[PDB]
Each structure stands twice: as structure tokens, then as C-alpha cells.
Symmetry: D2
Subunit: 224 residues, 4 copies
């Protein structure tokens, strides 16, 4: 009676931790939808002590997953950066690491039919409108977790997943092979192709796994 | 098939977030039990990115609940701090904050029969051997969550829980007054100073604000920008550490016991500025003003175990805390004026015996479900 | 340990209980899939004591739900009647009852975006190839459960769901009117008799109650009473079965095919007695009285598929059902007078093509969580005959 | 928002199926409790189409589990028979089969610490005040499921569990022979009949098969299929219920106490068909043939309690059971032939008192999760 349950899963998506929710498990009204996300995350609060998020920007992001609204997509995906300090749910942009969780989650939730060795998943990003391509290793109707692929920022080794960003060209503007990078915590290669105005492939190897599934509670009285 | 499922609860307990597991859901082999815990939390990792914990010691604490092995206790409770950067599951002391979630957990899981208005849950701490008494508000078979009691560290208000720490008297030491004195005069690099050493919940050393050259109502920014004060308080801390048996040497105390005993400096109730909010706390709302150090640095509020210890000291005739304390007549509450507010503690000590050391906490179940552990990482 | 967990939902779907699973949560290997399904249900075992099924075929049904395999469909849906008594998972037909829960399941699981006050769900049935159209009441991202609608076989009242079988027009024969004619003269051991054969959801034969020496308003004791009427109705049924191409022989029709086509005798709205409560149903409540045989015996109420078929025939001008129907005008519902109450159906036919043939159903989620199946009983044997 | 969630477990316990709820998960108000239970089960309704239960008395059973309320017991267990046909939840007895899931449930839920090979669980049956003891095979913190033990009425083979019903004499009356007699003649609408009433684990009424026009070896279909036998068995049942203080009227007995006492009709050993397989159970394999009625209808196997009670009666010189029983010689086992085969019970009555009442059982968790209940059905 004091609280309400919401189904909810938590993922490591690449170098991030995401909280994953199904479109229908959230309020239709945007005002209430935002209050409820803030309550799940434990925002606004520097410690995020009364909610699921872990007080770092890398561990305070949302993926809402729903039925595809695009004839060429298996699944719709809405990303949000949930502010730690402010009452703000920011829907501006795509998260490349978080989109690495989407495919495996879509398979494990039967939004996409599992095909052994490898399932191609096509993701419709809402914030952008653009399509992403995930190539997912599948074993027994579920996403493979184990294997020998190292990405920097995550201890140990996991099943590789290829993300294709090639149709991201246009992001905000509407206008536009393995190359290294010495980012904050190591190194990272990508399969770029530079040809003026068309992007052939922008593909990189990510990694993901499900950490938890269950129900978050959210206090009713705090939705005054 | 790749991953393994373990039943699991996440709670806010006081100003902490903990993971609450049941005894039987964990392997009995200590060595592998700990490999699982580390895997559940995501350690070792600065970022704890491949686990449930939030990469801060406040959000990296474990609670294993099981059947009571003590005839007066309802539930057994084993605490552990799970290291972030290392592969250690440290079961050493207890944690006063996390214990706040145990009563609500026991009720919601039906370890204890729900009784309306309030359910008394007696918790046997495993790490320590001591009992804690919880007074939980209950409604419709569950622990009440909503209400209008406020605690520092947690936004908003909630339902109160009464945590009595009376049985932790002589925690670290075996005695409420380890030194046998109500005030000890301590030799110091800067001359003699008066100190009062009390051991309830955790050992605490008390000093007059004047004797360390402060008004007592200073601000965290003023206090932390005083290398000289800090060097001095640590010096005093370390000497009493040696004095009460917790280290052989001041170096050892400073290096290997940085946390306990704690040190606080006290004054009489007077008006002061709430640092966090720029507003004035009237001296009429507090029975004394205190400034607690924790980890060679000012604690921005007041630690739970320091609260129980301060209140206990208040009631022992002759301690620095008792001298400074505004007489409370028949009120058993003492009101401690910390930097950002006032925290009440119910404190009854008759004849050197602690009969109540009870503070108000709060707790809330955040999530329930199953954690996943990768089978290959347990090799 | 000893057991493996599988996600799982139990639903009430129409007057049935179904176990609803998701495509990727079952094994791909067909032989192993049926194994796991059977362990879930507790079959074979006449009591089904070691699984979730209720040991009655009403409560031993399966729905596998996964992503759509059809351009116009939101979701794919596979049905199966799990056998109580033998190690068999029977994927033959479809169940208009079980599919009543598909729509709500799809919404509650976010396979179809929730729309208030109502979501249309397009269901692609695997066993059959046809599409089904669910109109579902939604509130706060979920199928409504509470409401004022009453269905027989379910205590109390619930939120109504519209289930449209109009895409099962000519499913069994390829044509709505398997003969081309709205009425046919059929030869009989008792003379010629008029018959209308319509094929929506399932083929039905329709007969004037008068032409079988009935008033049309009798009772399950009275009808089942005289063996001449029972015998004569099987004759007609078996002969039509042959005529529309589903048997080569009356004998074969009535032994290898006793369920379909079905047969009903019909009259205009009238007062008549409900056998279950000696009460009286006014003729203004109904748009025709009708009496349905199923398995050589009177059906005590009305079969789902017959309902959809009857409503359709009623709108096809000429047919016996259509001749005997009360005008409805603006109202698309036709109310059918069966022997223990009045079932309704939404029926629109325009220019020989059927647009709505919709039953009113009800559904509700009963439980969600994890079924356990014991791994040792899944182990692949050399040969397993329990005899 | 239309529906409420209730945590919930389904188990096969022995040869029955049960729903296991924890104490704090059901409302405190008895009337609201009983309305919730009915919604969870789907009652009343011949089909139980809108609830969890299976529309057969053996699949409409409830166990509620809570903390122990008895100084020698690890856990509390309250049984209820949920009526299929009526709005009735019946707490007047124990259930032997269901009680077999209680040990496994208590361990899997951490009310009892798991001990490898075998964990002893002492169980306080609420309804009756008596204690039963269970010995459970544990592996990896949970009750074992897999094994080589066969119990007739459940396909395949499982981990065995030893159930001990020795502390359960006079479960409802306070006396092994509540009338004082081994045999009483009862007045009846068909004239005088001999009955033995024995109260061990639960009270049972034993009758000669022939005194009711049966050969004793009939089939659920054959027995469930004649109204008169059924109406007459209930008359006997109801009358002995009143005669023993569990009811005021015979009408009340059939309406408010339809579960207990139970009634069985018995015969000397004979060949009979096992309805569930079709196989012939040989007369040399049993010591007697019993047909047990439960909820006005044949009990399709045999009750755990009725098993304890039937064996005890076999050892009391004079009872109908005793009269019909093949001499066992040195063997302490009595082999009871029920409709689905054979159940053995180690049964020693030393002239007055029950020293052994022991059987083997088997248990399995089938599903964990949340039942939903429609809020509007409760207002």
C-alpha cells in the first residue's frame, strides 16, 4: 500500500550501467513519467541513496524499450541521462554504450526471435530517429555472455557484440580500416570509412550483460 | 546457462544502501561464498560497473539475514563491507546504518510476525555477538514506509524506526568507561588537556571546544581549513586509541585504526549557522553543540554510533559532555546540535548501566529480484 | 541445482485457463521443446500433480507468444492442447478462447504500445495462418480487468474484449458460401430440405426448425430425448460434410469428422424457457432463437466458432438464418437465443465479403513468475515408452 | 491498478498440490483473509477457472507459513482446505501431504538453516497444536528434488523425505479413541452400523466396505458415480463429527467442517486396479485395502494424516482396521492399498500410546511469483 512495484532490469551495457524499462510499465503522461523515473533513479541527490542509480554519470542512465515504430526496426529505444543533482530527465541524444544493451535485452525478452550463432537486431533510436545495427551472439534463445573479448573499463572478458553506427551520419545536423584511440581508461578500435558524404560503416565491438531483473519500488506519497 | 540467478533485495537503510541476502541463497563454503558476493557487487573495480554496488563505501555494504541463533533474538544478521578496489569481503565490525534495514526486512519476509501500530524486532548481530532492538511501524503486514520524520543524508521524510543500541555498551573495550575515569587529564605536545572517553556503540573521545581553541559552533569549511586543529585532534585521538587498548602505538592508531575511536569537541547550547542552508539554529532547540571528526576530517553531520555514544556520555555525571549539557529534567531525549541540524537520542544510564541508547532511523525497500552471476567468473 | 527456472504467466482467457510462454524462453529443438512443455504442465498424469496444469482440458492449454512473422501482425501466436494422459503436445487447431488472452498479454508485456481507452491488437496465429483482431480496453499501460460484462462459465463480471474472426472467412473450404448458394435443396431419406452452409471460423449448416418438425424453442432433455431427430440431424450434417468436400462418404463424415461442419436449427425471436433456471427469455431480448448440435448431441449453450458463423449467415441476405432474423438496422450486434441465455456477436457483411465477425470475450492475468522444471526428467533417453 | 499482487509459491507436497503463502502476506482481519484466499484459489466455482487451484480437493489446499509460536518448533504451519464448490476456508485439521512441503519451503525460504545431507525441521501445526518432524535431504542450501524414491500417485522418482507423526495422538479430541470404544454402533437412516473412530494426526472413521455395499476395491469413477453411497458416507461422517464435538449440527458438519473428520471404508487384502495406470495391484503387496473419502468425494490417493491414523488403528486390538488387517508378524510396517497403489507406514502402538507413526514423502517447488487478485471483487 505505501509503495508501488515496477518491473525493471539493470544492465552493464559496454562501459555503462543502464536501468532498462518497457514502454508500457511507465506513465503515459510526461509529467508523471518524469517524476517516476527520478524516483527509480533516486534523483535529485548527490548520493542517489533512495534509488537504484550509483551517483556517477556512467551509472545514472535510462533505456526505455518498446514496440518498433519504424517499418525497418525490430524495436524502439529511448535513451535518457538522469541527472544526479537536478530534477531533470534529459532526452537529448544517443548513448553508444547503452545501445549495446538493447539488442541482448530485446532477444532475452522475446521482442526479437533468437537465431543461433548470431542474431541481427535493428534498433530504432527515438531521440534521433536513426537506426542502429546490433549483431548478437545467441545460445539457447538468450544472449551469450561469456567469451574472450576485452573492452577497456570492464574487468575480464565477454562475448563480443558488433554495433554499426553508419546511419547515425546526420545525428543533429542532417549532413556528414581499424583506427585506435587512447581514451580516459585505455584503447579502442573502430571500423571507419571516410568518403566525403556517405558513411559506409562505423562499426565497433561492444559488450553487455544483464545484472538484475525484478521490481523497483517507488513511494506513492512522493508523487504529490 | 551462462549466468546464475541469486534471489536478492536492495534497501536504503538509514544513509546507506545495502544488499540484503538470505543465509541459504549463498554457498556454505566461505571461500566461494565470498567469490559470489564480490561478483554480485562488481568488485574489484573502481567503477563497480559489472555488479550491483554504486562504487562508494556508502553503497557497497552487504547484509546476510538468517534464522536466530540466540534465544532472545528473532533474526541473525551478518554485516560485511565489500571493498571496491580489492577482492576483500570484510566482516569485521558492524554498521549502525545497515542494521536499520534488518527489522523491516525481517517483517516483510515474514521472519517476524507483523503487529499493528508497531512490531518489536530483536536482532542478533553475528559479527559482534550483540543484540539490537528495533521498533518498526507496521501496516497491513508490512513495514510502514511513509511518514514525516526527517534524517540527514536522505531527501524527503519517512516513517520513523527506533534503533536501541543499549546492548552495545562496552562495544570495543568491554567497559562503558574504559579508563575508569569520568575525565582523564592527558599529556600532549601542547600541554595537558581534559578528555572524556566513552564506549557505547563505538568508542568516543570528548573535548571542550575552548581547550582546542574553538567556539564549538564553527563551520565545516572553517574547521577543515585548520591544519593545526586537525593535526592536534588526530594526535589526541591516537593517544586515547593507545590508552583504551585499540593500538600499541600512535603511528599504529593513525595508520591502522583511522576511524575509531572517534573524536568530538563540545560546547554549551548556543545559536549557530547551519552551514548547508545558511540559516540559524537556535540554542533553545539543542541540549549541547558538538563537532564530530571522522577519518581525520570533520563529519558533515553526526555518525549514528557517535550519537549513541554522545547521548550516553551526557548522562554519566562528570563527563565533559554531561558538564556542558543543558539539564533536560524528565525528558530522556538529548538534542545534539550538529553542523546541519539537531538529532535527538533517547538516553538512560542508571548507575553506570546503559538502559537506553535509541536513535531514530529510516529505511525503504528499493528493489527485489534476482542478481545474475557469470559462471565463468567463479573459476 | 536440481531444477531450471522458466519465466511463465498463467491466464484466464475466455472460459479457459492458459499457460502463456514467450518464444525465446523455450528450446528451439522441437523434440526438446515438447519435453519441456510437458514437464511444465505435469503430463502425462491423469491428475497432473507434478506440474501447473489443472487436469481438465479446459486448464491444459498453451500459448507461445513471440515476434510477428506476418507484415500486418503485431505478434505471432502458437496454440497447443497439452494432453493430460499421454506425452503429446497437440498443435492442431486454434482456440478462440485462448486467443482471447493474447491481446492483453501482448500489451502487458509491451509487444504492442498501450493506447487509452483502447488498443487494437493484430494477432498472427501460427497453427492456422489467419489473423485475429483484438480490441482491448487499456488503462495505465495495461489491459483493464474490471468492468460490467458477463460471460457464461465465469463467475462475476469483467471488462469486455472484442475478438474478430472475420479473417477466418472460408478458412475450411476456401469460400464463405462453400456451395455458391445461400440456400440449397438437399435430398434426404425424408424428402428434400432447405439448408444454408456458411464458412466463418468453422463451417455450419443451418436448418429451419420447422423442417425438422421442431418449434425451435425446446430443451436439452426434450431434444436429446427423441433419437429420430438426433439420427436425422447427423444424416443432414454428414451429407453436407460430403457435399462441401470434407468427406467422401456419410459414414466417413460421421466417424472421421463428427465435429465439423456443425449443424443448427433456427427460428424467429420467441419466448422460451432456460433449462438451467426455469425462467423465461422474452423474444425482444433476441434476434433469433437457435439450437446447435455438437458431437451428435445438443450443445447446452453455443460454440464460439458457431456463434461467429451464425452472426455472419444472419447478414448474408437469402440464407435461412437471414430469413429468420429480426431487423436490427443501425445496430451491428446480433443477439443469438441459445438454450441457457443470449450470446451476442458483432457481424457486418457487405457485398459477399465479411468484415466483422466478433465475439465478446473476457480475460485476466492470474499469476506471473518462474516455473521450475526438474533437469533429470529432461535428460534424453534412448527410448521412452511409459507402458 | 485493477489488480493487486501477492507473493506466492506452488508446490507438489506428497501426492497433493498446494499454494504456500507466508504469514505477513495475507491480511490480519480473518474475514478479509478468507476473501483473499478464495480469490487466489478461484472459489467458489466447479471449474476454479478464475484462480490458481485445480478444481479437485487434492489441488485446492493452502499452507500458510510463519515464525514459530512453540518453543520446540522451527516453524509455524497452518493448513486450510479451500472448498471448490462453496465460499468456505476450513482450518479444522492438519494435512499430512501438504506438511511434506513445509520443511522444503522453510529451508528454501531461509526460515531454517540448511544443513548438508539432512536438515531436521520440527513443525508446529497450528490447527491442531501438534508437532511433526521432517528430515529433509539438502544440497547447496536447498531441499533436494532429484532422487530414487517412488511414491504411488506421482510419476517418476524423487528425493525422499521422512515424516514423523508420533507427537500427534488426539490431534482434535485429546484422545486416541475419542469415544473410549474401539467399535461403536451408530444409528443411521439405513439402520445400525459399526464404526471405529480413531484420532491420530487427524480423526478418522473406519467402516467395513460390505456394511456400505462395496467390495472396497472400486474406482474413483465407480465410487464418485453413485449419489447414494456419497450421501450416505456424508451422513455417517457428519454424525460422528457431531458425536465428537467438532460440530453442533449435522448440517454444520457438512457445511463448516466438510474436511475433518475423514471417513474410510476398508477390506482384507485383495487384487484391485490402479485407476491412474490401469495396472493390477496385487493383494500380496498390501496389508489392507482402504478407500478414503475427502470433501464428499473419493480421496484419489491417501491422506498423510489418514495414513498415520490408519496405521495406528491397525495396531489397536478391536478396531475395524485391526479386524481387516493381514497379520504383519515381526514387521512394523503396515501396507495400505489406496486407489493409486500402495503407501507403507511404520506404525507401533504399544497398548495405549503411539511410539511410531512414520512415512516417506517427496516434495517439489513448481512455481514462484505473484498471484493477482481483482480489487473490485474484494470491496
Amino acid at each position: 500500500s505505501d509503495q508501488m512495484r515496477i518491473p525493471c532490469v539493470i544492465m552493464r551495457a559496454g562501459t555503462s550501467k543502464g536501468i532498462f524499462l518497457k514502454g508500457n510499465d511507465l506513465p503515459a503522461d510526461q509529467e508523471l513519467r518524469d517524476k517516476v523515473i527520478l524516483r527509480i533513479f533516486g534523483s535529485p541527490d548527490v548520493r542517489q541513496i533512495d534509488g537504484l542509480a550509483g551517483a556517477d554519470p556512467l551509472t545514472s542512465k535510462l533505456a526505455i524499450i518498446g514496440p518498433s515504430t519504424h517499418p525497418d526496426a525490430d524495436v524502439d529505444y529511448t535513451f535518457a541521462q538522469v541527472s544526479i543533482t537536478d530534477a531533470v530527465v534529459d532526452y537529448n541524444g544517443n548513448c553508444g554504450n547503452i545501445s549495446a544493451g538493447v539488442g541482448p535485452f530485446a532477444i532475452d525478452e522475446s521482442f526479437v526471435k533468437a537465431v543461433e550463432p548470431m542474431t541481427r537486431v535493428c534498433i530504432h533510436n527515438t531521440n534521433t530517429g536513426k537506426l542502429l545495427y546490433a549483431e548478437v551472439e545467441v545460445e539457447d534463445g538468450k544472449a551469450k555472455v561469456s567469451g574472450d573479448c576485452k573492452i577497456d573499463g570492464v574487468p575480464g572478458t565477454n562475448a563480443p557484440e558488433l554495433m554499426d553506427f553508419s546511419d547515425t551520419a546526420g545525428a543533429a545536423t542532417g549532413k556528414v580500416d581499424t583506427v585506435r584511440i587512447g581514451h580516459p581508461a585505455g584503447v579502442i578500435p573502430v571500423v571507419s570509412i571516410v568518403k566525403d558524404g556517405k558513411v559506409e560503416k562505423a562499426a565497433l565491438i561492444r559488450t553487455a550483460r544483464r545484472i538484475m531483473e525484478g521490481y523497483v519500488y517507488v513511494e506513492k506519497a512522493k508523487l504529490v
